[PDB]
Amino acid sequence: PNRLIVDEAINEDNSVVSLSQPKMDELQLFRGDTVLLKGKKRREAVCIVLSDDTCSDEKIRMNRVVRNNLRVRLGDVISIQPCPDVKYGKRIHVLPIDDTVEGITGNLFEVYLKPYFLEAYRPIRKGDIFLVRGGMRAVEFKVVETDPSPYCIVAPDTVIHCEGEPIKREDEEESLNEVGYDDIGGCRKQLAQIKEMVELPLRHPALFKAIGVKPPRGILLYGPPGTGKTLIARAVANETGAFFFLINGPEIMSKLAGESESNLRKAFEEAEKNAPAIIFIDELDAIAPKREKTHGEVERRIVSQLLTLMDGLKQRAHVIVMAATNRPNSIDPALRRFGRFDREVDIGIPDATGRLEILQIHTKNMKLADDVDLEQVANETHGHVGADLAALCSEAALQAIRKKMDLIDLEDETIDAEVMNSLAVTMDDFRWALSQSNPSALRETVVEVPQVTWEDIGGLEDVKRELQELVQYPVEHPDKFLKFGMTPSKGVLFYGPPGCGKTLLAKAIANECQANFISIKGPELLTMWFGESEANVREIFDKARQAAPCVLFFDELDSIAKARGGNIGDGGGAADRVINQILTEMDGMSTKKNVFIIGATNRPDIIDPAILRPGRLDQLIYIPLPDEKSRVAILKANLRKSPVAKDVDLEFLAKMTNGFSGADLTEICQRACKLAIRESIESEIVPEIRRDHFEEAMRFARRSVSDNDIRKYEMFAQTLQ
Amino acid sequence: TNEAQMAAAAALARLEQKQS
Ligand SMILES: Nc1ncnc2c1ncn2[C@@H]1O[C@H](COP(=O)(O)OP(=O)(O)O)[C@@H](O)[C@H]1O
Numbered sequence: 158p159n160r161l162i163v164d165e166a167i168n169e170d171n172s173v174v175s176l177s178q179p180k181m182d183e184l185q186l187f188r189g190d191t192v193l194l195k196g197k198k199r200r201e202a203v204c205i206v207l208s209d210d211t212c213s214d215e216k217i218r219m220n221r222v223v224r225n226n227l228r229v230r231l232g233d234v235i236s237i238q239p240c241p242d243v244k245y246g247k248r249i250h251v252l253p254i255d256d257t258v259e260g261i262t263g264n265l266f267e268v269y270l271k272p273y274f275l276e277a278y279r280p281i282r283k284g285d286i287f288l289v290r291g292g293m294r295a296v297e298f299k300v301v302e303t304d305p306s307p308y309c310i311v312a313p314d315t316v317i318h319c320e321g322e323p324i325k326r327e328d329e330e331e332s333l334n335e336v337g338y339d340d341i342g343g344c345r346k347q348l349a350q351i352k353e354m355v356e357l358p359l360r361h362p363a364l365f366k367a368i369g370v371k372p373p374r375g376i377l378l379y380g381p382p383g384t385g386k387t388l389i390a391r392a393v394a395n396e397t398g399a400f401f402f403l404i405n406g407p408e409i410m411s412k413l414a415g416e417s418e419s420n421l422r423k424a425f426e427e428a429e430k431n432a433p434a435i436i437f438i439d440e441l442d443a444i445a446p447k448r449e450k451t452h453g454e455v456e457r458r459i460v461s462q463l464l465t466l467m468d469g470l471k472q473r474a475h476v477i478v479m480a481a482t483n484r485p486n487s488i489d490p491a492l493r494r495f496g497r498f499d500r501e502v503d504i505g506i507p508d509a510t511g512r513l514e515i516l517q518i519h520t521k522n523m524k525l526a527d528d529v530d531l532e533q534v535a536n537e538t539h540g541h542v543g544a545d546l547a548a549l550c551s552e553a554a555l556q557a558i559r560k561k562m563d564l565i566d567l568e569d570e571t572i573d574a575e576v577m578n579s580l581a582v583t584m585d586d587f588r589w590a591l592s593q594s595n596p597s598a599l600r601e602t603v604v605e606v607p608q609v610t611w612e613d614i615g616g617l618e619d620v621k622r623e624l625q626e627l628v629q630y631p632v633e634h635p636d637k638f639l640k641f642g643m644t645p646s647k648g649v650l651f652y653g654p655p656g657c658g659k660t661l662l663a664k665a666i667a668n669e670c671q672a673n674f675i676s677i678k679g680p681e682l683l684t685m686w687f688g689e690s691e692a693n694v695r696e697i698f699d700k701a702r703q704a705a706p707c708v709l710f711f712d713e714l715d716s717i718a719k720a721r722g723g724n725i726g727d728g729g730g731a732a733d734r735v736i737n738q739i740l741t742e743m744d745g746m747s748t749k750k751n752v753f754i755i756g757a758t759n760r761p762d763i764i765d766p767a768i769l770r771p772g773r774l775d776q777l778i779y780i781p782l783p784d785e786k787s788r789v790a791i792l793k794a795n796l797r798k799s800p801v802a803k804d805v806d807l808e809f810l811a812k813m814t815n816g817f818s819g820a821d822l823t824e825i826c827q828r829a830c831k832l833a834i835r836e837s838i839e840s841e842i843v844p845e846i847r848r849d850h851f852e853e854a855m856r857f858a859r860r861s862v863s864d865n866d867i868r869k870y871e872m873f874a875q876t877l878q
Numbered sequence: 879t880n881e882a883q884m885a886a887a888a889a890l891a892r893l894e895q896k897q898s
């Protein structure tokens with residue numbers, strides 16, 4: 158009894174551990190009860206139980222600080238017991254660790270220890286190492302003396318002493334600033350998938366020998382540079398405890414013929430001697446490029462050598478080889494054969510949430526001013542990867558150091574601790590860093606869960622429900638689809654006038670479903686068509702298969718037909734290279750992958766009709782121009798970004814804009830805003846948009862869909878019945 | 879018991895502030 162599996166925690170606090178309620182009932186404890194955790198090598202820690210709705214019943218969630226003191230790792234099991242006997246301490250002696258007290262001097266108690274305990278009522282245990290962050294530095298402290306033993310709660314009325322030289326770290330404990338899983342921001346799902354593959358073979362090697370199951374031996378990671386491929390490989394080795402050996406293409410290739418092969422073999426021999434071990438091969442496409450693409454004897458031979466060593470992993474017990482490449486199709490296909498590198502994880506580019514998480518991670522030690530808004534930065538940093546956001550945070554910190562602390566600094570190797578602790582980084586310093594940074598991955602497609610919700614779309618209430626029936630019902634009610642022999646649709650095409658919200662509809666359903674949204678825009682379909690590179694369609698669909706659950710949206714499906722002349726063009730048909738590859742991939746995609754494909758076109762009369770056949774976008778939804786009540790809803794939604802006076806009659810405007818699309822109502826909202834801004838500026842050479850600004854905007858705004866086009870759109874929808 | 883409920887109150891406050 159009372160044995161729980163060690164897992165990760167969300168709350169980074171050095172004293173909180175979370176349990177699922179069924180285990181809180183078996184231990185006869187409640188929220189806030191003090192418990193003791195017993196680990197390995199006669200070590201224990203004292204913590205406060207909280208509860209949540211995310212911990213598994215058999216697991217206990219704790220942060221790195223607790224795991225390090227218990228000398229346990231993720232996947233291990235610890236013993237937990239209540240200890241309601243604890244009362245507040247009297248005197249404690251806490252000293253810093255030398256490893257972190259570098260480049261700094263001053264009253265470390267007032268800077269770090271006093272905040273960390275002040276009205277915090279923290280449990281501590283003799284010998285515990287805890288981390289206090291601040292002043293752009295993460296400083297850890299050891300408890301060396303306590304009047305009560307072995308543990309107590311540090312209360313505001315206790316005496317905290319701190320005198321003596323910094324303590325040298327012991328060999329039985331690891332530095333709390335070493336790369337771990339809590340240093341990785343976006344791509345949390347990918348990290349979870351890797352943990353499932355590596356945590357058990359390495360932490361419990363006896364299990365895979367005793368049970369007839371084969372472990373993964375090779376994991377291929379890929380994505381743009383600066384996304385965390387190397388960061389993961391290092392974090393995994395540090396978290397599991399496996400010996401880490403680094404290999405990189407350029408270094409192996411820099412060696413002479415015969416030396417490159419010998420050195421590559423030695424790396425595998427060292428991993429075996431120190432097993433369990435993880436080998437990380439960076440730039441896999443450089444060390445082992447496609448043989449049929451290289452004329453050099455050395456580049457062709459090194460591929461054979463790596464393939465042999467990878468196969469030898471059946472004899473080299475407990476060795477896992479991870480590799481990183483920029484593109485999964487730039488490596489010799491032999492490496493991807495069963496065995497060797499048979500498992501792959503697409504890291505890709507951090508999404509809007511991940512970018513915020515990365516900014517939060519690289520600011521852990523930074524004191525941010527009240528005006529700092531990292532979510533706003535994450536939304537502006539489009540095309541940035543972890544390497545760029547890390548540089549952004551470092552530049553923001555550096556400018557704050559120049560503005561303030563550089564006036565205060567010594568002609569000496571060490572800063573006053575109080576100076577750094579009082580150094581706050583303002584929004585202006587983050588904005589400056591943003592202007593200096595340049596995204597390293599702006600062209601590659603970014604796949605993420607969209608932030609568009611149903612409340613952002615005016616009108617079309619019935620269409621919103623239709624998408625739910627096409628996307629949610631097949632998996633929310635699978636017993637009804639099986640009972641009635643229903644075949645779920647693989648996708649839907651939206652057709653009708655432009656500017657009615659087709660794009661938002663596809664995003665909104667992806668958002669509610671918590672599914673990744675893949676945005677393929679007209680220019681991307683045109684790029685493949687113009688350059689005769691339709692092969693890239695397979696990579697797009699591969700993203701949908703690996704990103705599942707996801708919604709794969711192909712916008713402006715008629716962009717090629719229009720780029721071919723649209724109304725006239727040549728004498729050919731609607732089929733072309735890009736759409737043909739799309740049709741092929743759709744036929745090879747099963748609904749069991751939880752991928753739903755949505756198309757949109759504003760010229761359905763020139764779309765390849767094959768896309769509407771069973772097995773493709775067989776469902777058709779007509780999206781008309783919004784009606785009067787919908788146009789008002791659109792105007793109200795678009796004006797949520799600006800002050801608007803109460804005199805503005807949005808219903809009157811909607812009555813006039815009878816032939817306007819939603820995109821045209823946006824122009825009216827923006828045009829009236831522009832007038833309000835211009836008048837406000839001129840008044841100093843006003844506080845809100847006035848009725849006169851909307852009535853003036855109506856004098857220039859026009860409908861983008863003519864009466865001739867409205868009838869064409871309606872007659873087409875009528876023909877389809 | 880009510881003495882350690884003060885550490886609970888501090889922990890719960892730390893957590894719910896960090897939700898901001
Ligand atoms: N997903 C990520 N989350 C957090 N930090 C990241 C992420 N990706 C990259 N970084 C940061 O960017 C840098 C990556 O450098 P490195 O580890 O050499 O990787 P690589 O050179 O393969 O991109 C590190 O400072 C790391 O902390």
Ligand SMILES: Nc1ncnc2c1ncn2[C@@H]1O[C@H](COP(=O)(O)OP(=O)(O)O)[C@@H](O)[C@H]1O
Nearest residue numbers: 613614615655656657658659660661791819820
């Ligand atoms: N029903 C609607 N509700 C809210 N906004 C809309 C609506 N229809 C169009 N819009 C606005 O018009 C813009 C263009 O919409 P979009 O679906 O991209 O049109 P198209 O696909 O024809 O170019 C969107 O950015 C959106 O803000």
